[PDB]
Amino acid sequence: ATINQLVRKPRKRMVDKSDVPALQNCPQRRGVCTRVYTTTPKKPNSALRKVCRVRLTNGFEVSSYIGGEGHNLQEHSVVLIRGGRVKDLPGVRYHTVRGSLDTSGVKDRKQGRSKYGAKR
Amino acid sequence: GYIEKLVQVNRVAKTVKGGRIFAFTALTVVGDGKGRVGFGRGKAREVPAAIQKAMEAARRNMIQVDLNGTTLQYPTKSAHGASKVYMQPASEGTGIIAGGAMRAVLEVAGVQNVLAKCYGSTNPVNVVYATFKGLKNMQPEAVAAKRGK
């Protein structure tokens, strides 16, 4: 740790590994739905949430959350991916964005229309 | 001094076999606008008394900080426990550029361009200690050297 020992072997700053294995410094990355299904939350909560499995165009097998209150993503859609880790859902770190290509958009959704895919 | 500044409230608990009884400690400082700073907190049940049970000792232990006039004496190296404090004087025009509990003690002293910092622990219980040991040894002339400079 001394300045002699720094010239011998200097302090290497340890790199921080990124949170997303996919999205290789890309803000969005297109995918194709392998499977949409139902997932339970973590124990101190309880609900029924709907997540999707996608293969990406990087060929990767990760899960994205369909963030709508209603969707017609019918098992082969062309859904677009953002990041962000949903807390209550374990082990998954991606979200399907609304109104991208095949994501139809949440019904009425009258505030936050830029988030959940609504015109006007 | 009547230029008191509240530092922190923090909700203290302790347990009886009946259950958990809660108490509030709250530290405030008291300065005079010219450099007599004080310290203290109180142990009571309630919010509006634990800040004046802080005044119970905050007017006590007031010591005249040896100012220069609007500007601090030196670059400072100071510590208490696991908190360490850096300071240095600034020139003319910048205001309060300290942080958290450092802007409370260094604004009641008559200096305004303060530029104080916190290193090690950030606990405001032990933070206000190292700030006054930063101000306890201030002297432009009170060295025993037989020379004005």
Partner: protein, 204 residues
Amino acid sequence: RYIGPKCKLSRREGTDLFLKSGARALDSKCKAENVPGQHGQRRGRLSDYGLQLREKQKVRRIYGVLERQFRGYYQEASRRKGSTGENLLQLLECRLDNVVYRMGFGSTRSESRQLVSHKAITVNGQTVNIPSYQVKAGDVVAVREKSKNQLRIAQALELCGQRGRVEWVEVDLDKKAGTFKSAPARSDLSADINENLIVELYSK
């Protein structure tokens, strides 16, 4: 510029704002006795950073300025040498949006900012149309010679000694032409601001 109805902006502050619509009063019929918002029949916890906000969010609501425009004016305060607070309101008084009314050609800043875009207020024999010109100490201030019989320019000459003189200009009322003499210090301003406390809303 901020637009819309403006009786509701006279209520948050408590000061007259120099934002009005006529020539007799302000906050005298648009029922200023409460604190508006979503639900404001009760107050509570009126302290530092939200007050440092209400300082700057008053100064923003007077001077026709956006935060695109105004926090670039704190950028010149550090480009200024020393005394950053009053040197902020220097360029708000070398501002032409205010000093049309600080002379008094228009009713308020809402008529001052407007007519200079409508090719009224020249600077020095040129054609200036911006509400951001920086008037030097010692130019004339005149009006283009087609808005002279615009009679709402004559609807502003009644408040010269009624809103009080500024005692920093020397103007000719016959020509409708003025002259900005010198820049103010912090003695020529209204006492409702805190100039080195708008400064503190920069780091947090």
